[PDB]
Design an enzyme around this catalytic site. Structure first.
Site, PDB file in Angstrom:
ATOM      1  N   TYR A 160       0.797  -1.225   0.000  1.00 23.74           N
ATOM      2  CA  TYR A 160       0.000   0.000   0.000  1.00 23.74           C
ATOM      3  C   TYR A 160       0.833   1.280   0.000  1.00 23.74           C
ATOM      4  O   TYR A 160       0.289   2.384  -0.118  1.00 23.74           O
ATOM      5  CB  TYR A 160      -0.901   0.019   1.218  1.00 23.74           C
TER       6      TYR A 160
ATOM      7  N   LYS B 259       1.785 -14.798   5.034  1.00 23.28           N
ATOM      8  CA  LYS B 259       2.049 -15.756   3.964  1.00 23.28           C
ATOM      9  C   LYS B 259       3.582 -15.848   3.923  1.00 23.28           C
ATOM     10  O   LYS B 259       4.218 -15.671   2.885  1.00 23.28           O
ATOM     11  CB  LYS B 259       1.434 -15.254   2.638  1.00 23.28           C
TER      12      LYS B 259
ATOM     13  N   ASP C 164      -3.723 -18.041   3.346  1.00 22.89           N
ATOM     14  CA  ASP C 164      -4.681 -18.814   2.544  1.00 22.89           C
ATOM     15  C   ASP C 164      -5.445 -19.821   3.402  1.00 22.89           C
ATOM     16  O   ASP C 164      -6.645 -20.034   3.208  1.00 22.89           O
ATOM     17  CB  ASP C 164      -4.030 -19.469   1.299  1.00 22.89           C
TER      18      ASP C 164
ATOM     19  N   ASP D  55      -6.871  -6.260   4.540  1.00 20.96           N
ATOM     20  CA  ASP D  55      -7.933  -5.835   3.629  1.00 20.96           C
ATOM     21  C   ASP D  55      -8.782  -7.047   3.201  1.00 20.96           C
ATOM     22  O   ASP D  55      -9.999  -7.071   3.366  1.00 20.96           O
ATOM     23  CB  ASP D  55      -7.317  -5.169   2.394  1.00 20.96           C
TER      24      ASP D  55
END
Lengths: 423, 423
Positions: B151, B221, B287, B311
């Site tokens: 971002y 992740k 995930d 998000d």
């Protein structure tokens, strides 16, 4: 090996013998248990569908724990050479260390063999316990870009001289002032290309056409990542129009009509394109898409997206239909004919050797393998048996403990039940 | 210094006058309709709760299209200045163009005001229509890092001189050979730091202690992005043990006990920590987390994650409990006291001006604002009334068309029903 013949390829199109040699990687943890059951289910389907005219000759190659222990290497060069030469392989689960260690063996295979498409079909099987009210409304096919994005593995650690070099270059050469904490930052590089996007979207559209799917949805977070994910969206629309103008209607085209003639005109043009059998090419912002797959799943068919988004979406979808331990997957290079069909779950070591793991993920990935070989009658035998067996409730522990009145069976027993139900 | 007065801060704690001036940005699309109802409901709660002792003086500031129309600037310095001076603000949605155009104004505000925590509470309101079977099992609080990650907006487009310089630097100076298609790639930069992670995780743990939550789950992740997301996981575990040693029991701690004394010693230690009321610090791969919030959401309480993951995760969770029409958010700098309250998403822009949309998201964001001011009684009045109103089935269309026997009402009328229901 002696027995069997090699598959070969001419212009991306497979030349498949009646006795093809198919390499396989057993996988770590529960891999060996699953393989014993899956291989036999697939073999049974082949003999029953083609009355002995066809037969698969398996050829073991090594990767992961088994390979390290046997050769001192996690991914022998020999394994990659065999897959390159024989084209089509099937593999069980492999292990990947977090925060450090060697990079993912799964990703190494995808990248080294340039298997640009990660194909993840998601559907509901009657009888499967699900956390959502209407899992039957989910029937999608995910085309996940498999060779670029943040998965490129281009990153530098906080405190390294390399991250310092990179930050200095960004700051001094590119006048970057947006790094909030430059002294303690690790940095990752995210590449997304027109070439990578084009081949992935092309495969997604080709698939929609061949299977009569109604739309392809481009998923991206293009408002924030304008030049990578936003570019993916634009490159996808551009490809769609440039190469499939006669079969598709895109939202980019909808945008232009709306601007030039109004939205009433645009809605009317989209409706006429549908009635005419045109495939709608649309797009959805990633975070919103994660909501809509739950609330409006019937609006999606084929989905095309990037590596990271694809990973998240595929898993979220699999959980939705209660298929976390049975989702099939395929890594395919549609230009060269190479493909690796695989278990999409983890190695679940706790049950290694206990013969109780659900072999369905590998079995369903084998269904994709059979379809890729053009052996559809065999593929259909497996799908139909899977449907009946699951609906009968003679299932492995993972399903049994979630259903009422189930007959929990071992992995091998479940494999046997599938064969029993093939007729 | 007229009738309304400015909030001031003292070493991080807010000194709120009884007649505070609170800046607000109306927002794009349906923002104006929501703001008209939301403001009155909040005013009503303040009046009813404190018998006239308190009053809010709203001060409009401009951003987005409204600011551009008036000043030729998307985010006037004056808007930033007023928000900075008055400390707390509330805002409607601001549209960010996809693939080009201006960088997100919502993000610009967060960066400019260093509002490092994006707080997203997720709980189920009885009566709200949900796509999952057990939305009641979902009660979490998401702490999303709000100032770094992808971002930051550091990216270069294919064909630009900048991307060429960057790609050449990576390939020639850092010997990168993993960019699959260097000639047609756009490149994004992803920074994740020790400083950024620490302040975010510290806030998440403080919240867990303060509100008696049982665990903090670090979502990442890290198996793919080792030096950014993997580093976030490690830095989060490190901070937990270093600053809150006596108050927590982490999975890192669990593993170290296993290495040293075996799995039984580690299992014994965790149970003793549970018994002793220690907060569990654990982690989930992103995930897999997206699957687990559907299959076993009761295993999560407080969640600490990065910008992008936050998000996606927040939206996936929101979809389980009502979605965008009811999901509130708060951008907060816990050290300085500054905060901006807002709904997670915008649109249903076709309803702009029709008095149709659900004003609940902004109303619930107002509840977070009231709590931030230390006006908990007013906040609780709003929550109780929202619970009473939704359960009575007097709701807006987004909800009405999903319930059975609901009484569909206008946006403005839903606001009046809430005030009516204030006990």
């Amino acid at each position: 090996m002696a027995q069997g013949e090699k598959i070969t390829v001419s212009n991306g199109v497979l030349n498949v013998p009646n006795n093809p040699i198919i390499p396989f990687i057993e996988g770590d943890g529960t891999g060996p248990d699953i393989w014993n059951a899956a291989s036999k289910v697939l073999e049974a389907a082949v003999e029953k569908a083609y009355k002995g005219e066809k037969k698969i000759t398996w050829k073991e190659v090594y990767a992961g724990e088994k390979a390290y222990n046997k050769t001192g290497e996690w991914l022998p060069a020999e394994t990659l050479d065999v897959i390159r030469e024989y084209f089509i392989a099937i593999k069980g689960p492999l292990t990947t260390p977090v925060g450090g260690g060697i990079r993912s063996l799964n990703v190494a295979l995808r990248q080294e063999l340039d298997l640009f498409v990660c194909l993840r079909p998601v559907r509901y099987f009657t009888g499967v316990p699900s956390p959502v009210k209407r899992p039957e409304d989910t029937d999608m096919v995910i085309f996940r870009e498999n060779t670029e994005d943040i998965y490129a593995g281009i990153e530098y650690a906080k405190g390294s001289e390399e991250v310092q070099k990179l930050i200095s270059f960004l700051q001094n050469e590119l006048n970057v002032n947006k790094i909030r904490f430059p002294e303690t930052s690790g940095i990752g590089i995210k590449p997304v290309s027109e070439e990578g996007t084009s081949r992935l979207v092309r495969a997604a559209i080709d698939y929609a056409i061949e299977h009569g799917r109604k739309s392809v949805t481009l998923v991206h977070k293009g408002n924030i990542m304008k030049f990578t994910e936003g570019a993916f969206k634009n490159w996808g629309y551009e490809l769609a129009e440039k190469e499939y103008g006669d079969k598709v209607f895109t939202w980019a085209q909808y945008d232009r009509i709306a601007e030039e003639q109004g939205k009433d005109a645009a809605n009317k043009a989209q409706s006429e394109a549908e009635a005419a059998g045109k495939i709608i090419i649309k797009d959805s912002i990633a975070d919103i898409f994660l909501q809509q797959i739950l609330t409006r799943p019937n609006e999606f068919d084929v989905v095309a997206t990037m590596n990271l988004n694809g990973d998240y979406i595929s898993d979220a979808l699999a959980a939705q239909v209660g298929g976390i331990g049975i989702a099939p997957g395929a890594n395919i290079n549609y230009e060269t004919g190479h493909a690796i069909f695989e278990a999409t779950h983890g190695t679940a070591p706790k049950y290694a050797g206990l013969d109780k793991v659900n072999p369905s993920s590998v079995i369903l990935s084998g269904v994709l393998l059979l379809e890729h070989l053009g052996w559809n009658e065999a593929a259909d035998l497996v799908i139909k048996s899977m449907e009946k067996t699951i609906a009968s409730k003679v299932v492995t522990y993972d399903f049994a403990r979630l259903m009422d009145g189930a007959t929990e069976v071992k992995c091998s027993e479940f494999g046997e039940e599938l064969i029993k139900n093939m007729d």
